[PDB]
Structure formats: structure tokens, C-alpha cells
Amino acid sequence: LPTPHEIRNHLDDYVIGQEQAKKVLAVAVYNHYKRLRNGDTSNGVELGKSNILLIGPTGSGKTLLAETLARLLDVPFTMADATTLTEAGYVGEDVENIIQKLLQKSDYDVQKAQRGIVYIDQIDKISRKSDNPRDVSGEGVQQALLKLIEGTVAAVPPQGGRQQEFLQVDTSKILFI
Amino acid sequence: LPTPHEIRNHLDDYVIGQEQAKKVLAVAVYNHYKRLRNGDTSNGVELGKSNILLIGPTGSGKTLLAETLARLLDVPFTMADATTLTDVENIIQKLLQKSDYDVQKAQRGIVYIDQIDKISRKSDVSGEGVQQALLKLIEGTVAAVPPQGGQEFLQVDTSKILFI
Amino acid sequence: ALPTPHEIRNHLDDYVIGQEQAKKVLAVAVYNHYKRLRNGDTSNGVELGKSNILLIGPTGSGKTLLAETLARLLDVPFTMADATTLTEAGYVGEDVENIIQKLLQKSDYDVQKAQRGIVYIDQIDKISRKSDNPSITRDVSGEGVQQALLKLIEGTVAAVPPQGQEFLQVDTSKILFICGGAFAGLDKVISHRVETGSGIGFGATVKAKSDKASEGELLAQVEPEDLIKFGLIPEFIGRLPVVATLNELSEEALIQILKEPKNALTKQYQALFNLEGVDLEFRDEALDAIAKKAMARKTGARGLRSIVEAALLDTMYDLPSMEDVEKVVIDESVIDGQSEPLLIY
Amino acid sequence: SALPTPHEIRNHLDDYVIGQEQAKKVLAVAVYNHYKRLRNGDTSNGVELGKSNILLIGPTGSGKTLLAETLARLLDVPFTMADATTLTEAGYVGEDVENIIQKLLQKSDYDVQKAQRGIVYIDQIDKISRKSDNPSITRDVSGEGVQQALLKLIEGTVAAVPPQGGQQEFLQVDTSKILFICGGAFAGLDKVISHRVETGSGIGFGATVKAKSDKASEGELLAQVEPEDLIKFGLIPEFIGRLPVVATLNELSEEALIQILKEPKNALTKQYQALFNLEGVDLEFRDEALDAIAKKAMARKTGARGLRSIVEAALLDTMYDLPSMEDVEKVVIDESVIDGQSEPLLIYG
Amino acid sequence: XXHXXXX
Numbered sequence A: 001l002p003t004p005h006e007i008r009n010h011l012d013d014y015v016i017g018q019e020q021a022k023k024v025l026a027v028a029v030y031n032h033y034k035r036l037r038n039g040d041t042s043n044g045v046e047l048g049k050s051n052i053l054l055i056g057p058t059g060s061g062k063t064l065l066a067e068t069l070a071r072l073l074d075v076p077f078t079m080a081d082a083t084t085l086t087e088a089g090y091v092g093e094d095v096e097n098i099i100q101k102l103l104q105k106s107d108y109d110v111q112k113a114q115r116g117i118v119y120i121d122q123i124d125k126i127s128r129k130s131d132n133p134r135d136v137s138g139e140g141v142q143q144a145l146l147k148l149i150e151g152t153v154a155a156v157p158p159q160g161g162r163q164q165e166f167l168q169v170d171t172s173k174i175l176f177i
Numbered sequence B: 001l002p003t004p005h006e007i008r009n010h011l012d013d014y015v016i017g018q019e020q021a022k023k024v025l026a027v028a029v030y031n032h033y034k035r036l037r038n039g040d041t042s043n044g045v046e047l048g049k050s051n052i053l054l055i056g057p058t059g060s061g062k063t064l065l066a067e068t069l070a071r072l073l074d075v076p077f078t079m080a081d082a083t084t085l086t087d088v089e090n091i092i093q094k095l096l097q098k099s100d101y102d103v104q105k106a107q108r109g110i111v112y113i114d115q116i117d118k119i120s121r122k123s124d125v126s127g128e129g130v131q132q133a134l135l136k137l138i139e140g141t142v143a144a145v146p147p148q149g150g151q152e153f154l155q156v157d158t159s160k161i162l163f164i
Numbered sequence C: 001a002l003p004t005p006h007e008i009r010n011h012l013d014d015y016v017i018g019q020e021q022a023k024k025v026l027a028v029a030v031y032n033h034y035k036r037l038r039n040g041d042t043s044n045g046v047e048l049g050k051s052n053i054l055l056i057g058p059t060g061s062g063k064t065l066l067a068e069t070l071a072r073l074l075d076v077p078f079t080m081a082d083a084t085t086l087t088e089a090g091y092v093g094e095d096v097e098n099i100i101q102k103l104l105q106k107s108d109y110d111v112q113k114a115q116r117g118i119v120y121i122d123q124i125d126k127i128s129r130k131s132d133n134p135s136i137t138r139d140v141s142g143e144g145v146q147q148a149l150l151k152l153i154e155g156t157v158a159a160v161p162p163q164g165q166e167f168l169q170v171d172t173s174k175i176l177f178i179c180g181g182a183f184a185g186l187d188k189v190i191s192h193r194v195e196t197g198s199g200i201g202f203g204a205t206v207k208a209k210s211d212k213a214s215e216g217e218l219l220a221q222v223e224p225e226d227l228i229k230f231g232l233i234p235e236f237i238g239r240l241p242v243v244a245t246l247n248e249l250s251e252e253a254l255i256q257i258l259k260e261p262k263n264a265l266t267k268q269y270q271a272l273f274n275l276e277g278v279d280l281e282f283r284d285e286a287l288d289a290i291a292k293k294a295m296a297r298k299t300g301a302r303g304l305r306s307i308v309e310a311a312l313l314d315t316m317y318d319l320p321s322m323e324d325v326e327k328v329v330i331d332e333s334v335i336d337g338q339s340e341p342l343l344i345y
Numbered sequence D: 001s002a003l004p005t006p007h008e009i010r011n012h013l014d015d016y017v018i019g020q021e022q023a024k025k026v027l028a029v030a031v032y033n034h035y036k037r038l039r040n041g042d043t044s045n046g047v048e049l050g051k052s053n054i055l056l057i058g059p060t061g062s063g064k065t066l067l068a069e070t071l072a073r074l075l076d077v078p079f080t081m082a083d084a085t086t087l088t089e090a091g092y093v094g095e096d097v098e099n100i101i102q103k104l105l106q107k108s109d110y111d112v113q114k115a116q117r118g119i120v121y122i123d124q125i126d127k128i129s130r131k132s133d134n135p136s137i138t139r140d141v142s143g144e145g146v147q148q149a150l151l152k153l154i155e156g157t158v159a160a161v162p163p164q165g166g167q168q169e170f171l172q173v174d175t176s177k178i179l180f181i182c183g184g185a186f187a188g189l190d191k192v193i194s195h196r197v198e199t200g201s202g203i204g205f206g207a208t209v210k211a212k213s214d215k216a217s218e219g220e221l222l223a224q225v226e227p228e229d230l231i232k233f234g235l236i237p238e239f240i241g242r243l244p245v246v247a248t249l250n251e252l253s254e255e256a257l258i259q260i261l262k263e264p265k266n267a268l269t270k271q272y273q274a275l276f277n278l279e280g281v282d283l284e285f286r287d288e289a290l291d292a293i294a295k296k297a298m299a300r301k302t303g304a305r306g307l308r309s310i311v312e313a314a315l316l317d318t319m320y321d322l323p324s325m326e327d328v329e330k331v332v333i334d335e336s337v338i339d340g341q342s343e344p345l346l347i348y349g
Numbered sequence E: 001x002x003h004x005x006x007x
């Protein structure tokens, strides 16, 4: 279903001035979904994970690519923020909340949510700067995010409960930007 | 269970161009892990705690050796760094983050450090800070680590933990 | 029962080689520590004082070894912290109270039992006032730590979070402290002062100094004023009246440490070989060669493991696979690397 | 209700301290007058009765910290023994000034009306002082800044302390009538005062040379201490103005050490006698040995605290083997034993 | 509450 030729043209309609970047996203997007079509069934073992790392100046269209891609793509999309993220959830937020918002977009569809896309803005915010230290936005956030990005099942109460049960939604399948 | 000859073959499957390095890790890992089995039943109590040092050019697969070995033996391994240090507690909890619950299972894990030359004593708070601080770490100790972040603290021995 | 000083010395004797004067100090100190706990508050004498210990010696002399081996037979709570991490209050480095934290963990959060414990401090030389330093500056690393420790050694109450927004008060007057560390350049300081007193002119008399190195005997003649020039504060020295001088390992000390201690590498390696059913023997020729190499390299006893590991690095590769080998003999050539060790069937 | 007198309270402190008549007189008048200001709880014609804190200055190991400890025993009203190294300026990681008040309530059982009339002691006050002059471009957080915070505390104010660890409530405790005794050991104060008073010069022809004939640091360079001298040392006028009274302690003399070994009830020799008694061996100290110890102690220049090193090191060999020995009725130490030339004499049964 | 660290 994914097409790298057409997707580049589609992004051109909404984005201009970044031709090389469109080629990179089309390959990773196509490869990631192709992997899930036949999961770990090929002869090649230890297949490299397909992820995306957007790096560009201000006003370059980073937030724009996430919006245009969401409209064109059929799977649900989410737009989170790293500034709100905090470690051990004191008063700010928790990493697991990112999965809760994804289900709201997918209407509590685990089969449809695992094939979703994730985009985190202001990645530099979580940069570890602990020279003079506890730190709630530094190492703690990156450590929790790395655990999630590695691929692990996290408990998420579906609908919040009327039960004491949680669903083990996978994470290795979901993509991250 | 494995042997130095069998581990060497497994090591060669994923690593090449380093023959002397294979024999060093095979005996060190086999002997070190052997201590965990015998424990203190033998007359020679207070045995073990032999560290491993690796010095080589960048891109030689020093990190790959530990990761490949961890997969071959199915033992938890973490990859920490000393360049960040100016904490020590971060290193201990890091390993626990693999499973988040280890009493008699994380003691047998392995750890790798990169850019060991950075801490060299310039002659200068940037250097020599770490070496004096790592002495007690290498010699073995127990550090408080909140399991999962939370209200009971966990004590984990470091003497058994091997350092590379 | 209570162990006697002679009784505890023989215990340390197995794990400690070449240190006679140091064993007497820790034995008398620990033995006195017990009496102060029992005799205290049940004797006519009241407000029993306290006496700490100050270990001084070269590197790799066995200072850290005494702190660990003593805890085995003592059975009271013991801990081990590093001074270098400590910094003056209000700074990024660390605080002095941290040291108390570790002690509680070793006593299973027992305040009544933690006060009766013992503490050891390594690398104490790293905190000394820098005589040659700019006046307008603050040595939070070296001077601040000493200032903050003054009240701690005398005895006081410090806030401590239980188990790591409430705190627990824990007395410290009964707690013991054993500070130790290598002092580089101290030998020249003490040498100067004891031999400083002579001029250069014709009328001025000339002393006969520099007769011997007296490395082991010069540290024994240490006094508090000599440490002031080094960087220590007089108040800090007053808190540590007792002093201990540990000399460098002898030429043949390594030979004794290889065989006499129960925890020596020779016995440890034999255990590895013994479980496989192969006996391990080290001849005198092989052991003496290792001692000469260790001292020639100047690494010390700490580096001794490297020589033994490298000598058996190649040989150990095939011992488990090999069969019909009841005994193995180590020769001087093996340590040198000229020839491989012979296998006995 | 008959309160004690200075002559009576001095007799108690004299039992624990020797050769400090100048400083002991100050503590007696303050403790005596502290009860008068307490009795007149806004019941006297003179409103806002003045306050007079105390500043105990002395050499190392002279007994400053010992005076506050023994004082609390015979004292009925509460007391505390805090420090200043752990104090940080306005909310830093180290500690806050309100921690001092929290300790006072622990001793008084959270009795506000009973804690306001208490006494407070601080040690190592000299350590928190900017060594540099007034500019201090770098903002030291443990120097003179700490002193500035205490101004409101000494003058009198109210702080917030949670009760028994917690509610969302705090307790207000006045400090108008609370006394403070900040005692510390000042190093290098003799050199600063010499420049101002001696004003010595010996290069030119007209200027006179003292030739190392000036008064000793403790003999005459401490008694004539004035606020202006402390400014060069790094203190702030505002901090010294809050502490008008000053107490100068002289360095222990050779004769003073002899009395300290015998007269105090907590003397080191008495402690060894009790400790040796537990073993079952009596302890006797010869007169020749006591004076010899005093000569050695002064050379160390460590104060009374240095005495333990001389006695313990001298008898370390004896204590090591004494428990093994049996039926040893007495142990006596000779003059030579202090030097180390000869071993002590023991009696067997 | 917050964190303070400087020198």
C-alpha cells in the first residue's frame, strides 16, 4: 500500500524547500510497515529497527511534516510534547499517558493502535544537563523514554475502568519520530 | 556450562580480527562465572573479583564483544559511560532497569565503559575526580536503589558484578 | 564473650602480613571501644572520652584490607565511605551527612545499634588546605570538609532522612572513626623540619642529616605541627590523637603474602584448579621471580594479579578440555614466558 | 523561688573548667540576668528590656565547646548545641536557618512558651566569614551571607516549623528574648591585630625594630580586640553589633594542664582509672609523669585535646598485653615511661 | 520542593 513516489509528491503539495528529507521519510515509512507485513519471518535475523530522527532549524517544517503526514496516512497519529514529560509522574505527566492519547485517537483499538505513528516535538528539551543537580526533566525522562523506545509492553487501563486490569499493548511495532 | 573452546567458536561467529582478545575473555568469564557456582564451599574463600580492561582503537568492536557475549550466554548486560560523570548511583540502577527486579540475578551481570582515557589526570577538577570515586565502586559496595521508582529500598552487592 | 587483644591479633595475622604496629593499635582501640559501651553508665567514672585512629602509610600497604578483615570477626555494624566525594555544605559535590546514611543501611536501620558501629575513611589526604593557593578562593573540597567534620567527630546530632519530609536524630559521640590514606610528599615535609635546623654560613654549624632514607621510620616521627604545613588544620588533628605508621612492603613480603594468607592468590587459584580435579603447585623459583617483577614495575601488591593472570592466560584456555592431568607444575620459565608449564599425567 | 547566684553557678563550672575566670564570669552574669528578664514577662515598668548575647573566643581545644555542654547539665531551662558549617543562605540544598529552632523544640517537647526562654549555642562561627573584602563578585553562599540571615533571628522574629512532622499549619515562635552564644576558633587573628596596634616598621633608619619582643598571641593580642579588627577578618559590622559581649580565653599553660588531669571529675586520668578498674588492675600516675606530659603537650600546640595522643601512645603497649596478664594488682607509670626509654612497672600476686 | 546547585 505505501508508495514512495506518490508520498513524495503528496508532501510537496504541503511542503517546499526540503527535497532530500522527503526521500528519507518515504524509505523509513515504507520499510517500517513492510517489516510488520512479515514480522521476523525472513531469513535475516536481528533486523535493524526502523526509526526517524528529524533535525532542522526553526521554521523548517518539522511540526508541518507531522501534520501533513497524519492527514495523508490512514493510521491514527499523535502530537505530543517533551516539555510536559516528567519522571516518576510527580505533578507534570507520565510517559504512559502518551499511549492513552493514542487509544483515544484509535478508539481503544489495540490492533489498530500498534500500527500507529508517534511524533515528539522539542526532542532537545530532554537533553541531559545535570552538571549541577533531583532532575525531573533530564536523565529521568530520557531513561524512561529509552525503555519505551526499546520495545516493551506497558500497562494501560482501557477506558479508565468502571476491574483492576490493564492491557499489555506492544511497543516495538509502533513507530516513533 | 560452556567451555573456552566452545565460547571461542561462538565469539568467532560474530567477531573477527581479534584472536588474543577472545582467549582473555573466555578464561576471565569462565573463571568469574565459576566463582558464582562454587561460592564459599571451597577452602579458598573470598575468591574472585577480577576486573577486565580493554584498550584499543575506536571501531574495533569493543562494545560489540560485550553485547555479543551477553546474547550468547543470555546474561543481562548494560552499557554505561564515565564521560558523563563529573552519578555513581546512576550506574547501579541502570543495570536494574533491564528487569527492574533482581536480588540474586543482577549480581552476575556485566557492565561496559567507553572513553576511559577522558578521566586521565590533567596536570584540574575535570580529571582525577572520577578515578578516586571509582575506587570504592570497583572494590565492591552496596548502594540504595528505588526499585521502579515507587517504599522500601533495595540493596545490591557490587563485588560479584564484573566491570569492563 | 569478648575477644582479647591477643585473640584478635592472631585473627588479623592470617589476613595481614608485615604489619605489627598497626595491629596493636586497632586491637587496643577496638578492645577499648567495647569497654566504653559496657562500662559506660554503669561505672563510677562518667563521661568516658573517645579516641580515634589515624592510619598513615604508602599506597598498597594494606590499609583498606584492615578495615574489611576487622569487620568479619567483629560482628558489629561497619561501613566504608570516601572523603573525596564530600564537599562543603551548599555545593554540588556532596554533604558530610551522607557518610552516616551508609552506616544505617549496614545496621538495618537500627539507631541504637548504629551508634555502636565503626567507620573507616580512605583517601583522606585529598582534603588538605592548599598553602600555595590564591588567598581569595574557597577550598570547599579540601578545607570545607575538614571544618564540617570537626563537630561530627566530637559528637553531635545530625538530621538524617530515615531510609533515604522527616528526619531522624542520631548521636555521634559514641561513633568511632578511622581515617587513613597515603600522603605523597609528607616524607619531605617531616624530613625538612627534623633536619631544618642548620645554616649555610661558616659560623653556622652543619647537621649530619640524610644518613638513611628512614621511610618506614620517618613517618613514625610524625607530629601534628608537621601536618599543618602539609595542609591539615590543627583542630582536625586534635580529633585524631592516635597515629599509626605502616611501612612499605619488604622485598620478601610479597613471597609471604602469596603463601601464608588463606586468601592469597595461590590458594584462590588452587581452588579453581582443585574443583576440576587438577592439583596446582607453585615452586619457590616461580614465586620469587614474580616478586622481583612486581617491585621492578613499582605497581605494588595491587598489580600482582596481572603477573599471575598473564602467566596462566594462555595455559588456562585448554585445561578444562584437557583430561588425564592430575597435577600441574609452575616453573620460573613459565612466568618469564620462555617455556610453557609441564603437565603431569 | 530562690534562683542561683554567680558564685554558686561558677562553683559548678569551676569543677569542670580551670584557668578560665575571665570567660566563666560572663556566662554567670548572662544566665543570672537571663532569669531576671524572664521573670519580668512584660510585668515591669521598663518595656523592651535590653539583651546582651555572648561571643566566646578562644584557641583550639581550650574548652569552648566543653563549657556549653557542662552548662546544660545544671541548667533547668532548655539548651541546644548546633553548628554553622551546614547552614546555607536562603533555601540552598544544604540547610535552612529554621533547623536550629526545630532542635530546640525537640528538647522542650514542642513547648513554645517554654522554648522561647531557652538558650542557644553555635560552634565554628568563624568558618562562615568571607575571607575577601567587600566586593565579593562571586556570590559565596557559605561566607558572610549566612551572618546576614541571622540578623533577623538574633534581633527577634517568628519562623515556621511543622509540628511533629505534620495539617497544612505552621507554628510561630518569637525569638525576641532567646539568647545566642556563638563560639568559634579564629585563626590568623593575631596577625591582623598586629598591623593595627603594633604598626611595626624596621626598614628605615628612624623606625624602631621590635626584634620578636612583642606580646604573645594569647597574652595581649586577644584581650584588646575591637569590632574594627574583625572587619578585616571578614565579619560584617551588623553581625558584631548584635553580639556586644566578648570573652577572651587564654591558651592552656603548663600549670593548667596539671590541674586538668586531677581536679575535673571527667579528667582523662580518672577515665583510665575506671577503665582499668573494670579489668581488675589499679592505675596510679606518678607526679613526675604528669608534668612531663604537660611539656610534651605544649610542643604539639594542639591544646587539651592533644594530651590524649601522648597518654594513649605511651600506654598503648601496656593495654595491648594487660588483659592476657592475670593477677596484676597494680600498674604504675614512671617518668621514663612517658619518654619511652623504659617500660612501666607491674605488680603480680 | 525545587533544586538548588551552584558554586
Ligand SMILES: Nc1ncnc2c1ncn2[C@@H]1O[C@H](COP(=O)(O)OP(=O)(O)OP(O)(O)=S)[C@@H](O)[C@H]1O
Binding pocket: A014, A015, A016, A017, A057, A058, A059, A060, A061, A062, A063, A064, A065, A121, A122
Ligand atoms: N517548510 C515550510 N514550508 C512552508 N511553510 C512553512 C515551512 N515551515 C514553516 N512554515 C510556515 O510556518 C508555519 C509554522 O511552521 P512550523 O512547522 O510550526 O515551524 P517549526 O519550526 O517546524 O515548529 P517547531 O520548531 O517544530 S516547534 C506553517 O504554518 C507555515 O505557514
Ligand SMILES: Nc1ncnc2c1ncn2[C@@H]1O[C@H](COP(=O)(O)OP(=O)(O)OP(O)(O)=S)[C@@H](O)[C@H]1O
Binding pocket: C015, C016, C017, C018, C019, C058, C059, C060, C061, C062, C063, C064, C065, C066, C122, C181, C182, C257, C301, C302
Ligand atoms: N600489608 C599487606 N599485607 C598483606 N596483604 C596486603 C598488604 N597490602 C596489600 N595486600 C594485598 O593487596 C590487596 C589490596 O590491598 P589494599 O588494602 O588495597 O592496600 P591499600 O594500601 O589499602 O590501598 P589503598 O587503601 O587504596 S591506599 C589486599 O587485599 C591484599 O591481598
Ligand SMILES: Nc1ncnc2c1ncn2[C@@H]1O[C@H](COP(=O)(O)OP(=O)(O)OP(O)(O)=S)[C@@H](O)[C@H]1O
Binding pocket: C150, C154, C235, D016, D017, D018, D019, D020, D058, D059, D060, D061, D062, D063, D064, D065, D066, D067, D184, D185, D260, D264, D304, D305
Ligand atoms: N578547661 C578545660 N578543663 C578540662 N579539660 C579541658 C578544658 N578545655 C579543654 N579540655 C579538654 O578538651 C576537650 C575538648 O574541649 P573543647 O570544648 O572541644 O575545646 P574547644 O576549644 O571548644 O575546641 P573547638 O571549639 O571545637 S575547635 C574536652 O573534652 C576536655 O577533655
Ligand SMILES: Nc1ncnc2c1ncn2[C@@H]1O[C@H](COP(=O)(O)OP(=O)(O)O)[C@@H](O)[C@H]1O
Binding pocket: B014, B015, B016, B017, B057, B058, B059, B060, B061, B062, B063, B064, B114
Ligand atoms: N569485528 C566486527 N564485526 C562486526 N561488527 C563490528 C566489528 N567490529 C566493530 N563492529 C561494529 O562497531 C560498532 C561498535 O563500535 P565500538 O567498538 O563501540 O566503537 P568504540 O570502541 O569507538 O566505541 C558495532 O555497531 C559493530 O557492528
